[PDB]
Copies of this chain bind each other. A is one copy, B any other.
Amino acid sequence: MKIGIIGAMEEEVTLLRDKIDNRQTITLGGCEIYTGQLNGTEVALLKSGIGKVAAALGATLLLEHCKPDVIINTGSAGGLASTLKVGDIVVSDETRYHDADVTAFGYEYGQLPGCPAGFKADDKLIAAAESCIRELNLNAVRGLIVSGDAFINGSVGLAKIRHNFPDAVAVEMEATAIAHVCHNFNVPFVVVRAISDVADQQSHLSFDEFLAVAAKQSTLMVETLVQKLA
């Protein structure tokens, strides 16, 4: 049982990194992987960097060099569903690209040729995460998470996403790329992130302020989830 964990930013991986025993590091392809035991569980924790390509590169390296059994994508996210507040958890049942458009060839908006329109997250991983949410008594929303190479702060950027993906519960910049890579190698995948902002209302300022809260909450979730899978 080796669990892969991927976060984009230093701030998102630092708490999980500090809790790894017999921690060794691989710096490769401009990313970092940290290997060891987390509460006596073998894990590979990747710091990918930001955006779709960084995440895809990182995910590929992780899968190649660490051969994890599953991948959990952790970190912050912009909340779209109205029940969500800063700190709350979001769990993917599906990921889609909100910025992909080959509709001129009759693909569905969001869909890239050779891909499904959206990528289904693993039902066992989702079940596990929902049990972790009940144990910890966290507030959480399960739903479609959308990814793009844009930081969303209201206006037409947010309106476009709500028009094209009315059911999207959160927006971010890596999850669908990781899902795409995992799909291609048939590795079970799930996103377990926490809200740093509401993708509007000066989200850049909320992000500066509440990223630490979001890192702490997703970290709590991930630790518990990893324990529960082992």
> Which residue numbers of A lie inside 8 Å of B, CB to CB?
29-31, 49-54, 56-57, 59-61, 63-64, 97, 99-105, 112-115, 148-151, 153, 157, 176-177, 180-181, 183-185, 203-204
Could you say which of A57, A150, A153, A183 has the most chain B C-beta atoms within 10 Å of its C-beta? A57
Measured CB to CB, the closest approach of chain B to A186, in angstroms, equals 9
Contact A153 B114, beta carbon cutoff 8 Å = no
Closest to A30 in B: B184
A63 cross-chain contacts in B, Cβ below 8 A: 29
State which of B112, B114, B153, B183 has its C-beta within 8 Å of the C-beta of A149. Answer: B112
* Contact across chains for A102 and B56 when beta carbons are under 8 A apart: no
Give, as a whole number of angstroms, the nearest-CB distance from A63 to chain B: 8
> How close is A169's CB to chain B, nearest CB, in angstroms?
21
Residues on B with C-beta less than 8 A from A183 are 30
Contact status B149-A104, CB under 8 Å: no
Q: Check B204 against A100 for contact (C-beta < 8 Å).
A: no
Q: Is the CB of B64 within 8 A of A101?
A: no
Shortest Cβ distance from residue A177 to the other chain B in the assembled complex, whole angstroms: 5
Chain B residues with Cβ under 8 A from A113's Cβ?
49-51
Are B151 and A57 in touch, CB under 8 angstroms?
no
Q: What separation, in Å, do the CA atoms of A115 and B8 have in the docked complex? A: 13
Contact call A53/B50, Cβ cutoff below 8 A: no
Residue contact B150 to A53, C-beta cutoff 8 Å: no
A29 & B104 in contact (Cβ 8 Å cutoff) = no
Q: Is the CB of B149 within 8 A of A180?
A: no
The complex places the Cα of A227 from the Cα of B5 at a distance, in Å, of: 43
User: Known contacts A60-B56, A61-B64, A113-B50; is A102 also within 8 Å of B150 by CB?
Assistant: yes
